[PDB]
C-alpha cells in the first residue's frame, strides 16, 4: 500500500475513534523508512497515545480495586490476574512504539525540533512502562526514561526558543516524570516553573503559527504547579 492511502485511513480512523486502526496505518507508514512529515508524526503520536492510554487507565482502575478488596477476601487473585493481562498489553504497545523510535524515527530525524520530539516520545513511553514496572525492570525503564528526556532537554536548551511548544511540552512531561516516577516534588516544580518563567520572559516571541500550542502548554505547566502546591 502507498503512503497517501494509509494517511487517509489514519485520518478517518481518528475521527471514528478507532485508534487500533489508526495506529496500524501509521505504523505501516513509519515502516516504509522515510522521515515523517509533521502531519504524519502527529497522527502516529495521537494514535499510540490513545491505544496505550486505554491500558494506562484500565490498569489504574484495576490496581485500585485490587487494593480495596481484602487479602482474606481472596477475590483479588482475579484482580491480580486481570491487572497482569492489562500490564502485558501495555508493555507490548510500548515495545512497539519504542521499536519504531529506535529503528526509524530517531535515526531519520534531520532537524533538532524533530530529534527532541522523538526523544521526548521515547521518554514518555519508558515513563508509561515505569508506571507499572517493578524490581530491576523498573530500575531499567526509569533510567531509560530519564536518559531520553535529558538528551532531549540538552538539545532543546541549545536549539529551541523557550516559547517553542516542543520545548515547553518536554518540560511539562519531564517534570511529571520527576513528580510521579522519581517522587521528587522539588525537582518537578523547579523544572516546570523554570520552563514557564523562561517562556513568560520571552512572551513577545510568540507568533500566529505557534501562540495557541505554546500558551496551551504554559497553562498546563501552571495547572500542574497549582496541583503540586495545593499540597
Amino acid at each position: 500500500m502507498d503512503k497517501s492511502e494509509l494517511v487517509q485511513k489514519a485520518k478517518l480512523a481518528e475521527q471514528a475513534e478507532r485508534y487500533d486502526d489508526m495506529a496500524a496505518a501509521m505504523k505501516a507508514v513509519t515502516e516504509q523508512g522515510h522521515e515523517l512529515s509533521n502531519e504524519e508524526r502527529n497522527l502516529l503520536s495521537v494514535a499510540y497515545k490513545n491505544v496505550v492510554g486505554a491500558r494506562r487507565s484500565s490498569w489504574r482502575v484495576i490496581s485500585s480495586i485490587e487494593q480495596k478488596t481484602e487479602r482474606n477476601e481472596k477475590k483479588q487473585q482475579m484482580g491480580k490476574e486481570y491487572r497482569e493481562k492489562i500490564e502485558a498489553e501495555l508493555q507490548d504497545i510500548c515495545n512497539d512504539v519504542l521499536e519504531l523510535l529506535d529503528k526509524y524515527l530517531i535515526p531519520n530525524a534531520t532537524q533538532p525540533e524533530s530529534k527532541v520530539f522523538y526523544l521526548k516520545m521515547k521518554g514518555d513511553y519508558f515513563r508509561y512502562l515505569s508506571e507499572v514496572a517493578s524490581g530491576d525492570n523498573k530500575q531499567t525503564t526509569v533510567s531509560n526514561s530519564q536518559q531520553a528526556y535529558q538528551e532531549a532537554f540538552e538539545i532543546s536548551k541549545k536549539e529551541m526558543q523557550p516559547t517553542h511548544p516542543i520545548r515547553l511540552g518536554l518540560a511539562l512531561n519531564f517534570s511529571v516524570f520527576y513528580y510521579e516516577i522519581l517522587n521528587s516534588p522539588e525537582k518537578a516544580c523547579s523544572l516546570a516553573k523554570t520552563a514557564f518563567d523562561e517562556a513568560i520572559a520571552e512572551l513577545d516571541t510568540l507568533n500566529e503559527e505557534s501562540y495557541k500550542d505554546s500558551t496551551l502548554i504554559m497553562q498546563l505547566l501552571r495547572d500542574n504547579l497549582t496541583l503540586w502546591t495545593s499540597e
Partner: peptide
Amino acid sequence: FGGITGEAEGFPATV
C-alpha cells in the same frame, strides 16, 4: 489525590 495513584481529576497533565 496522589497523582496517577488516585482518581483522574488529580492526574497531572502531559502532552
